[PDB]
Symmetry: C5
Subunit: 395 residues, 5 copies
């Protein structure tokens, strides 16, 4: 138009984009700063970073960009691109990014009274420490610290406004708890002036539905599958063909677990020690079934059945469980009969040994069950906010 | 040439690329906006993004770029690069991109009446929520929301035109259903002026041919392979050498399944619960086998054959199935005969127990089949648009 | 030098890099366009793109860049950087690239008569549809479509020249067949002027040596390894310990196959159905060997040997195969003799059943071999250009 | 303001950003250089690089940027962007980076006396040699070498200041030991002037908690699980059903080990030879078992029991271990008796052979245990700072 | 300073950065070119590229940048940034890079006589053909071809200088052999003037320590572990439980081999055919075992022991190996005796068949050993520079 052309020609005359737009040079310039969170992109525990989508919001006042609306009855606001007017240098301090800015400087909008507003959108990669002591049941607090790079507290004083969580697009893996802000001042013992900054604390909680279905339940159908070796009669020629195949079927289960657990060496995750306990129990279940077949396959005429074995394994532990010419012909037939009687005696001795083996089997069955139940309950229930997680997530 | 040189010199004289090219400054500038979809590149459920190839199209009118064709009889159109003439600032709102623009501003073509046309091509990464409750049979709706960053409804009013699906280059994994557009206005209670925007809704459907061939059929040849353990006589020493090898051969099958299923914890996918049901059925098929070999390997002189076991397992359930000197020599020979008779009696008792075991085997065979059939049919048929998917994809 | 300094000062005087360098403004400017292919980098079937290394070549004539060599006896050619003289705006149309250009604008060389030559090198990512119906034996045709963005046919008319395949650096995975070009004109019913474009069609063929050695022969040593279960006597207690281990040894073979096959759901690849046939045959080989051990382990006094079973399995199918006081002592000894005779009769019945089982085993052996041979030959030989591929690749 | 506007207009008048801001051109310009480490991002042994987060700090003095505060009572400091004033050209020498700079040049702050301070933040990818001879127990020293690209020692002399490790954000995988600095001068035999440079040496130590729990303990529960094959009686038909399944269950354990061990061919890592020893011991445990069942399954009438075998295996090694008409009837019965006696003699011979086999089994059991214990202790304890690592990490 | 300010103001007066800085325009400008290799980053055989770290070095003379040191007694050298003075346009020809330059143009240093030096550092991605016929024992020659883009031999003649291998930082995977250079001229039949270029040939050798320890030895302990099946008596019910588990334990070994071997289809690597031979031998070892148990489990009264089988398998091949009223009572007892004699005859026939089986077992054992030894030695020793590789690498 005819009027905005001359307005734009007049506004930028004798304008310096390097000076602070204040009328006295001794008074601070109040800048209002706010943030808007759009979505949480990633939380990386390897490099300890947090990738989020954020729109900043900055507002201030300019003194050399004022005009009278009556003289220009067609224009009420103007817009200036990057590098033509003064803008605050507020930027993220952590900024664990390659280019360190990720801001995409957009246009700046100015009213007829000089009130300037500037909001750039971006994807921010902050650096926060991640604690993974309780890997599945985890709650994290990360920080975003904003401030001016080269302005003091008597030139550019930051002010804080509440964030905006409208339109959050929930992640589906991390449950956002909150994001409060706080403004702080840091004095230095050379200047006696403040250096304000504004920090926002994102607090979030991990969802434990995928891990409780794809990791836990699979490994409780295998830990309890080993115990069947204590209910299988030893007469069948397959007692380690089942005991050693459950261990191999679970060793291949750790190939899809190692792609989930973290690689940090600071602490031992809860799921790691749970899986270690399952490993140890399944491995130790195979040791016992070798001390049972030694009892079952004992030589009839190569042992003595020690008295202690007969008392412990047949009287005490078996009552708790509630188990319970003519002369030559005569000589030849007598020989055959004696042979048969000797075989019968050997069979009786073998039967005693087999009963001892069965008693051992039931004794070993009765204890591994309580062991695995106690371990499974205690390891999982030791973590805090476990009841909170199972109430919010499953139910 | 001689004429276009002076035309280009004259057009850019006293021209400001910051002002809106209108003749009154109080009338809106109508801008026509349209879109062209070239292909769908990716749909990422981890970060919940959608990558597509799109050519935007913008058209408007300029007032300071008008000339008379009679005075310049050689030129009818002109072209201006980026940064030399005014262009609308319409841009995507979601834009879950690092650089946030992905536009590649090309040249602007101007006719002899000022009608300007500008179409930049690009690859756009929008952010839309993805629901994966029914993972294989899935239908998704995503949105692309375009508007002006810093212009109101009384300065730059958007207008909508239909999209263009010519030359779509079908993806081969997602079946496009449609892409309709809609224009909306959003009033604010400080200005009483509209802020129009234009949104296009891409609706697409997932193709279920790869999943039905590479995932389902493999796991129906293994779920039905376990049932053979109920048709194998127990005399052979292989009843757990087959029962436990099918479970291990399916545990290694979940290594190529975990690379397909999503990792979202918001809901339980249909394929996940189907695979869990298969897991549970195959695991429980091994528990029953141990309770069959206990019947087969029973001690002849260590039990009593309870009456209930004899009635249920041999009378009722067995009829539904339609199973059905001289003195010493004499004494020695009599001893041998009595021994043989005792062995015969023991063999008869063992035979009764083996028949009971066979009856149990057939009873257990008759039920697991209906269990697996019911589960397989019901889980898959519960999803909506299942008939539509199988009609469009397979047939 | 003294002369080229004044030449450069004189050439760029009153020069506009925005106008078309023609002497009448009504005559077209002929631009000669050609291409040079350096190597094929990648062919991605997921996003359906083709990445290649290409040097374009453009030539035209300029009217304002002419000088007399006699006046400047030291200079014959000049060079201008990007942004100082007019260049054609020919670019790839498909250009499924993030930055959409990938051109690296180099210097422009000008002779003493204005003849300008300009060749930029780059890596181009085109978008072409990939058909994978016959995955190993595959032939692909992709297109590269070049043209001017904003110039008609009466201002900048494209001309075509043959490509240059010298220095091709063969890929080692794709065998290049050819690359012919074609020029086309597209009229529009608003202007009645042509809009020429130039398209080059790269035709290539896949090499099938890696797949035929690392995927096929592996799975013919396992498909034929299962059949040995039909040559193993049933007396040994290992018949399912071999049948079920070949299936598990091939289920783990699909872990290194799933990383090669494509994920497209448009059609079923040939190798996919070949592997499915191998899976089905190996799985069905285990069903039969359970109906053989049922015949071998039959109870002597629990069946009747149906007449049909005796005729089919022992007369017809067995001839095709070419298989083929004193009283008490007397009473006791007579009892023992009768016992022995009964045992002999039972053994004879068992022997008959075992012979029936062996006949079944040979009958089942004779058919699976022809099944697998027919499937293996027919599935592979059904693809076209199979003889061409095996002649060019292996021999 | 009114005053800083004229100050900025006056400072940049007749200013050249190419000249060194010194007052005599023959005196050196002292530049103070310091570094601040924020966190360690990665240590890559494949390409031998180290990625860290670092803020440099540079300070110097300018002569043309001095003003009087009394004349401008409102301003005390000024700020200049990149490309408007002179800055030192100190950069990292190693800089194994694509863009080689990674600096993000920020603003430069100037006091009222010309003292300039400039600190750019960035992510630096240095190139240092990594020694992995002792892979788990590893200590690394990497270098960062800074200096001026094109300034001598008589123009820009570097000065060193101590680093700053405040706010380190510990990595959780590498334990930082220290980072001392050193300044050096390098004369050349053409100029006789120094060329100073400043080098910082980051010394760090690897944490060995993850490797000692997820790699070692798993493989000590499998190496010791094979030895059970020497405590399992040979009467049960499972002795290579356990010996060969432990080897297969640990062959699948090397799939999750190969993703951790380095691929360098310069030296043999300690964990590699430890795993090789476990491979060899477990594989050799199966060879012995075959030489035990040959003794157990010896033919009664097909051998002689050599004298050496009887002395070594039954006298010496068995005492260390502390093992320990009427005529025809008469003829027929005598025949039966003789048959029985022959069978008894054969059984006695078989019993002798089985005892020899058991002695061999115990002899082989007693040695593999000490072998594996010695190997496990010696291989791990040979590395230096092993006690230091286990004291700092585990306890 | 006062003097360098006026020197900088005077040098750039009337200076054109587009002209060649020569004093006659008819004489060539000699440019000295050299290279410095810092480290080898990668050698990729998929896309056939080579990534290295290189500092170029260029030197020439300028005519308009000369001054008298007496008039400016404080300055001896000057520095100019990119884009202010003339620089040669030498660049890499292959340059299989996205941006095609990777140069990072630094400052240019000029002495008081005009002698200019310019050395940019960078990471270069060249394109060279990689031959992988002998994958472990491999020697590669790649080329780097430098030259001027648009200057002839009568304007800018290249000169060559030796490279600099000081500070090489050895890779640890590729052993550098050398890097010699060569300068060449290429005439064209339109101009009759040379077009010189400079090429450096990097020759390197692969280190074979990782492959010889992590791939070969693992697959030698498994190839020789199968042969134990020929030393295991058939009485034990484990002869296929060991033969088929070694094949499955080696099928899972190809999962960590497929991540190492190349995917090129141009030629078959040596390691590929070695692994194929191991596969074939291990698979064929199981076929023979089935033909041994057919001999051992032969029916006593279902065969005839063909004469050829008795001569070959028991006379010739067994000598090479050095194997070696009263009437009824009488009738009943006679019946029992006859039964016993028949059983004895059947047992004798079975014993003959078992001896034949043992002879077959030893005959098969004696040949597979020489087969595997010959294959293993011949395949590895066929490659050239094998002795050189094992001498430099292992010893
Ligand atoms: C401008 O700021 C600089 C900051 O370095 C001041 O230099 C330091 O000033 C303090 C104050 O006395 C001294 O203790 C230090 O020794 C100074 N540093 C050096 C390297 O000398 C400088 O004095 C300030 N100038 C004015 C006029 O305030
Ligand atoms: C400016 O520096 C250049 C650096 O190359 C000097 O050129 C070399 O000078 C040495 C000193 O005598 C000679 O030995 C070399 O032969 C020169 N190089 C060449 C390629 O000729 C140059 O002399 C210096 N000029 C002044 C005035 O000091
Ligand atoms: C600027 O502020 C100071 C106090 O902060 C005041 O003394 C001075 O008068 C102000 N400037 C003007 C021009 O009034």
């Amino acid at each position: 138009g005819e009027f905005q052309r001359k307005l734009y020609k007049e506004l930028v005359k004798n304008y310096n984009p390097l000076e602070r737009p204040v009328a006295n040079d001794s008074q601070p310039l109040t800048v209002y700063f706010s943030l808007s969170l759009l979505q949480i992109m990633d939380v990386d525990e390897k490099n300890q970073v947090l990738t989020t989508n954020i729109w900043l919001q900055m507002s201030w006042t300019d003194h050399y960009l004022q005009w009278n609306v009556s003289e220009y009855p067609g224009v009420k606001t103007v817009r200036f691109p990057d590098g033509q007017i003064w803008k605050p240098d507020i930027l993220l301090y952590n900024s664990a990014d390659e280019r360190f800015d990720a801001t995409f400087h957009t246009n700046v909008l100015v009213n007829s009274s000089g009130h300037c507003q500037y909001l750039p959108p971006g994807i921010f990669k902050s650096s926060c420490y991640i604690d993974v002591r309780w890997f599945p049941f985890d709650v994290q607090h990360c920080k975003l610290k904003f401030g001016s790079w080269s302005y003091g507290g008597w030139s550019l004083d930051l002010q804080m406004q509440e964030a905006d969580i409208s339109g959050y697009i929930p992640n589906g893996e991390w449950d956002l708890v909150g994001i409060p802000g706080k403004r702080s001042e840091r004095f230095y013992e050379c200047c006696k002036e403040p250096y304000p900054d504004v920090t926002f604390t994102v607090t979030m909680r991990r969802r434990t539905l995928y891990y409780g279905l794809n990791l836990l339940i699979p490994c409780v159908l295998i830990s309890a599958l080993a115990l069947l070796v204590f209910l299988l009669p030893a007469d069948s020629g397959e007692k380690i063909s089942l005991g050693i195949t459950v261990l191999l079927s679970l060793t291949v289960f750790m190939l899809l677990v190692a792609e989930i657990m973290p690689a940090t060496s600071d602490s031992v995750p809860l799921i790691a020690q749970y899986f270690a306990s399952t490993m140890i129990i399944v491995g130790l279940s195979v040791v016992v079934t070798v001390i049972v077949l030694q009892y079952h396959h004992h030589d009839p005429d190569g042992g003595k059945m020690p008295k202690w074995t007969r008392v412990i394994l047949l009287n005490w532990c078996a009552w708790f469980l509630r188990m319970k010419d003519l002369a030559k012909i005569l000589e030849e037939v007598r020989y055959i009969a004696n042979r048969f009687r000797c075989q019968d005696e050997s069979e009786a001795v073998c039967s005693e040994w087999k009963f001892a083996a069965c008693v051992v089997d039931r004794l070993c069955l009765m204890a591994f069950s309580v062991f695995t139940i106690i371990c499974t309950i205690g390891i999982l229930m030791s973590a805090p906010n476990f009841v909170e997680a199972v109430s919010k997530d499953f139910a």
